[PDB]
Amino acid sequence: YDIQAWKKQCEELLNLIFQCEDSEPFRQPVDLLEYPDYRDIIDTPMDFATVRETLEAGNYESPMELCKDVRLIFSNSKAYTPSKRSRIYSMSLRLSAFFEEHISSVLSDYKSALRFHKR
Ligand SMILES: CNC(=O)C1(Cc2ccccc2F)CC1
């Protein structure tokens, strides 16, 4: 029932994601000079270094907010490269499955702790 436990759990899951080779294209913002039409398609760029920095700055109130930003990394990649046969699409699907598999208990434990607090 630890209301704060999600933060270190998210730091550890981000460490695992950075160690995955599938995270390479997502570790820093998409270079706005290599893909000059990126902002024509993507309104809100997102990447794992921005997520880690937002978490470390104390600028997420809950793991649901972190989860929303991570899901935005994958929806941005699917919008910019829609081909299910592209290198980035297949890496996105694998990394997203890994992330969702691990974030599920973090969200459940956080929500359970808040319900216990307000019992
Ligand atoms: C998340 N990155 C992307 O969406 C792009 C760049 C990119 C894709 C694949 C591998 C290296 C890469 F640099 C297409 C813009």
PDB file of N, CA and C in Angstrom, residues 4-6 19 24-25 38 44 48 55 58 61 63-64 66-67 70 78-80 87 91 106 108 110 112-113 117-118:
ATOM      1  N   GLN A   4       3.915   5.897  -2.816  1.00  0.00           N
ATOM      2  CA  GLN A   4       5.042   6.460  -3.569  1.00  0.00           C
ATOM      3  C   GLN A   4       5.860   5.424  -4.339  1.00  0.00           C
ATOM      4  N   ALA A   5       5.584   4.120  -4.148  1.00  0.00           N
ATOM      5  CA  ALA A   5       6.439   3.082  -4.711  1.00  0.00           C
ATOM      6  C   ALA A   5       6.565   3.092  -6.218  1.00  0.00           C
ATOM      7  N   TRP A   6       5.539   3.604  -6.926  1.00  0.00           N
ATOM      8  CA  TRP A   6       5.534   3.596  -8.388  1.00  0.00           C
ATOM      9  C   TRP A   6       6.741   4.301  -8.983  1.00  0.00           C
ATOM     10  N   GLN A  19      18.152  -0.496 -21.703  1.00  0.00           N
ATOM     11  CA  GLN A  19      19.052  -1.620 -22.017  1.00  0.00           C
ATOM     12  C   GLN A  19      18.586  -2.436 -23.235  1.00  0.00           C
ATOM     13  N   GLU A  24      16.557   1.902 -28.946  1.00  0.00           N
ATOM     14  CA  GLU A  24      17.488   2.854 -29.568  1.00  0.00           C
ATOM     15  C   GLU A  24      16.838   4.028 -30.304  1.00  0.00           C
ATOM     16  N   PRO A  25      15.867   3.800 -31.210  1.00  0.00           N
ATOM     17  CA  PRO A  25      15.279   4.930 -31.938  1.00  0.00           C
ATOM     18  C   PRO A  25      14.474   5.886 -31.051  1.00  0.00           C
ATOM     19  N   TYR A  38       8.564  15.933 -39.845  1.00  0.00           N
ATOM     20  CA  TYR A  38       8.086  15.252 -38.646  1.00  0.00           C
ATOM     21  C   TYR A  38       6.999  16.038 -37.911  1.00  0.00           C
ATOM     22  N   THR A  44       2.937  16.363 -30.766  1.00  0.00           N
ATOM     23  CA  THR A  44       3.617  16.298 -29.482  1.00  0.00           C
ATOM     24  C   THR A  44       4.675  15.215 -29.487  1.00  0.00           C
ATOM     25  N   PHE A  48      12.042   8.491 -24.553  1.00  0.00           N
ATOM     26  CA  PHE A  48      12.304   8.004 -23.201  1.00  0.00           C
ATOM     27  C   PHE A  48      13.222   8.881 -22.358  1.00  0.00           C
ATOM     28  N   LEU A  55      10.144  12.441 -14.909  1.00  0.00           N
ATOM     29  CA  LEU A  55      10.045  11.650 -13.690  1.00  0.00           C
ATOM     30  C   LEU A  55      11.049  12.161 -12.666  1.00  0.00           C
ATOM     31  N   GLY A  58      10.363  15.352 -10.756  1.00  0.00           N
ATOM     32  CA  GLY A  58       9.192  15.350  -9.894  1.00  0.00           C
ATOM     33  C   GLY A  58       8.014  15.977 -10.611  1.00  0.00           C
ATOM     34  N   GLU A  61       2.706  13.198 -11.385  1.00  0.00           N
ATOM     35  CA  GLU A  61       1.963  13.006 -10.136  1.00  0.00           C
ATOM     36  C   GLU A  61       1.598  11.520  -9.953  1.00  0.00           C
ATOM     37  N   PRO A  63       1.783   7.191 -11.927  1.00  0.00           N
ATOM     38  CA  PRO A  63       2.342   6.365 -13.010  1.00  0.00           C
ATOM     39  C   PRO A  63       1.412   6.384 -14.223  1.00  0.00           C
ATOM     40  N   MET A  64       0.112   6.748 -14.058  1.00  0.00           N
ATOM     41  CA  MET A  64      -0.775   6.869 -15.223  1.00  0.00           C
ATOM     42  C   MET A  64      -0.266   7.975 -16.161  1.00  0.00           C
ATOM     43  N   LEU A  66       2.884   8.999 -16.523  1.00  0.00           N
ATOM     44  CA  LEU A  66       4.100   8.485 -17.200  1.00  0.00           C
ATOM     45  C   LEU A  66       3.675   7.520 -18.320  1.00  0.00           C
ATOM     46  N   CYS A  67       2.707   6.646 -18.015  1.00  0.00           N
ATOM     47  CA  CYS A  67       2.209   5.674 -18.972  1.00  0.00           C
ATOM     48  C   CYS A  67       1.627   6.375 -20.214  1.00  0.00           C
ATOM     49  N   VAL A  70       4.537   7.465 -22.347  1.00  0.00           N
ATOM     50  CA  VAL A  70       5.217   6.349 -23.030  1.00  0.00           C
ATOM     51  C   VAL A  70       4.353   5.875 -24.198  1.00  0.00           C
ATOM     52  N   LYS A  78       3.897   5.089 -34.846  1.00  0.00           N
ATOM     53  CA  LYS A  78       2.937   4.456 -35.753  1.00  0.00           C
ATOM     54  C   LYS A  78       2.339   5.491 -36.722  1.00  0.00           C
ATOM     55  N   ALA A  79       2.200   6.750 -36.277  1.00  0.00           N
ATOM     56  CA  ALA A  79       1.625   7.789 -37.153  1.00  0.00           C
ATOM     57  C   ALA A  79       2.641   8.207 -38.193  1.00  0.00           C
ATOM     58  N   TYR A  80       3.926   8.349 -37.804  1.00  0.00           N
ATOM     59  CA  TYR A  80       4.935   8.782 -38.764  1.00  0.00           C
ATOM     60  C   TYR A  80       5.365   7.660 -39.708  1.00  0.00           C
ATOM     61  N   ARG A  87      10.967  -1.176 -40.145  1.00  0.00           N
ATOM     62  CA  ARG A  87      11.839  -1.537 -39.044  1.00  0.00           C
ATOM     63  C   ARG A  87      11.315  -0.920 -37.747  1.00  0.00           C
ATOM     64  N   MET A  91       9.869  -2.701 -34.160  1.00  0.00           N
ATOM     65  CA  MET A  91      10.569  -2.402 -32.895  1.00  0.00           C
ATOM     66  C   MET A  91       9.589  -1.790 -31.895  1.00  0.00           C
ATOM     67  N   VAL A 106       2.560  -1.985 -11.856  1.00  0.00           N
ATOM     68  CA  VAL A 106       2.851  -0.669 -11.276  1.00  0.00           C
ATOM     69  C   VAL A 106       1.559   0.137 -11.150  1.00  0.00           C
ATOM     70  N   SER A 108      -1.622  -1.089 -11.155  1.00  0.00           N
ATOM     71  CA  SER A 108      -2.502  -1.802 -10.221  1.00  0.00           C
ATOM     72  C   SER A 108      -2.104  -1.541  -8.769  1.00  0.00           C
ATOM     73  N   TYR A 110      -0.359   1.009  -7.556  1.00  0.00           N
ATOM     74  CA  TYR A 110      -0.593   2.398  -7.208  1.00  0.00           C
ATOM     75  C   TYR A 110      -2.075   2.639  -6.913  1.00  0.00           C
ATOM     76  N   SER A 112      -4.329   0.499  -6.025  1.00  0.00           N
ATOM     77  CA  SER A 112      -4.667  -0.249  -4.807  1.00  0.00           C
ATOM     78  C   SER A 112      -4.223   0.557  -3.557  1.00  0.00           C
ATOM     79  N   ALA A 113      -3.037   1.175  -3.617  1.00  0.00           N
ATOM     80  CA  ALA A 113      -2.525   1.947  -2.484  1.00  0.00           C
ATOM     81  C   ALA A 113      -3.391   3.171  -2.253  1.00  0.00           C
ATOM     82  N   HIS A 117      -5.595   4.126   1.051  1.00  0.00           N
ATOM     83  CA  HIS A 117      -5.455   5.405   1.738  1.00  0.00           C
ATOM     84  C   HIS A 117      -6.800   6.073   2.001  1.00  0.00           C
ATOM     85  N   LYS A 118      -7.710   5.988   1.037  1.00  0.00           N
ATOM     86  CA  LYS A 118      -9.022   6.619   1.148  1.00  0.00           C
ATOM     87  C   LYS A 118     -10.115   5.696   1.673  1.00  0.00           C
TER      88      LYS A 118
END
